Amino acid sequence: EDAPWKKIQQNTFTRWCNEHLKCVSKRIANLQTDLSDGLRLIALLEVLSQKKMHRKHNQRPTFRQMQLENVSVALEFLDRESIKLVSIDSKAIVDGNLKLILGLIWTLILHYSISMPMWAKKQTPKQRLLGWIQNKLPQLPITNFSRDWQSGRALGALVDSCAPGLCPDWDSWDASKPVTNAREAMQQADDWLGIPQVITPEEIVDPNVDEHSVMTYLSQFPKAKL
């Protein structure tokens, strides 16, 4: 983690998180520290499930035993809801294990933002979303969530697919201007489709952008049932 690209998933997951907590008045500044007492994790779970937790929690969790109980309430909720998790336990969150915490948020995005608004038992959520984009853009070979998006042009194309007239000249856009294109597209999706910029233009056309960051951004397109 010298290289500035390794930070993209973290940036993007965190903006994803804030987007869902912005109306219950919380925000994360640092995912490694700001979920450790369990309170913001609970705020997030409640907004995404549109439910309330099954039992009470420690509203003022001054010491670690209380923070572990809080986190164990988020985690049981998730068992209760049938969201399987990747090697997650309470101490992982309270102790600030960043790789496990990034993985938890990904499990959430994958479930709430991709798997749940798409209804295909033998169809993976990566596959559902791939298929949704391919259906909006039948004239583009769309096979991945990285290199296909690097020029900015598939973005123009998807946004215009969704609201024709927003990026009508996408196919004449200069692929040597990947940031300019990305920004033009993603602003038009911001302004006219409601799609927030949880990944930045610079980040989305980065040579080493990870697919999970890009899926996070794109998954907002059909959860907004376009």
Say if residue 84 is in the same domain as residue 69.
Answer: yes
Angle at which helix 178-193 crosses helix 153-162, to 10 degrees, equals: 20
Say if residue 84 is in the same domain as residue 106.
Answer: yes
Name residues whose C-beta falls within 8 Å of residue 53's C-beta, 6 or more positions apart in sequence. Answer: 42, 45, 46, 73, 74, 77
- Whether the CB-CB separation of 90 and 68 falls below 8 Å is answered with yes
Say if residue 9 is in the same domain as residue 101.
Answer: yes
Say if residue 99 is in the same domain as residue 1.
Answer: yes
Say if residue 181 is in the same domain as residue 209.
Answer: yes
Cα distance from N-terminal residue to C-terminal residue, the chain: 37
Name residues whose C-beta falls within 8 Å of residue 32's C-beta, 6 or more positions apart in sequence. Answer: 96, 98, 101
177 CB neighbour count, 10 Å cutoff:
15
Domain that holds residue 89: 1-117
Domain CATH for 109: 1.10.418.10
Three-class SS state of 157: helix
Question: Count of domains in the chain?
Answer: 2
Say if residue 141 is in the same domain as residue 113.
Answer: no
Say if residue 99 is in the same domain as residue 155.
Answer: no
Q: How far is CA 165 from CA 54, 160, 173, in A?
A: 47, 6, 15
Say if residue 169 is in the same domain as residue 215.
Answer: yes
Among 61, 84, 117, the domain boundary falls at 117
Which structural technique was applied? X-ray
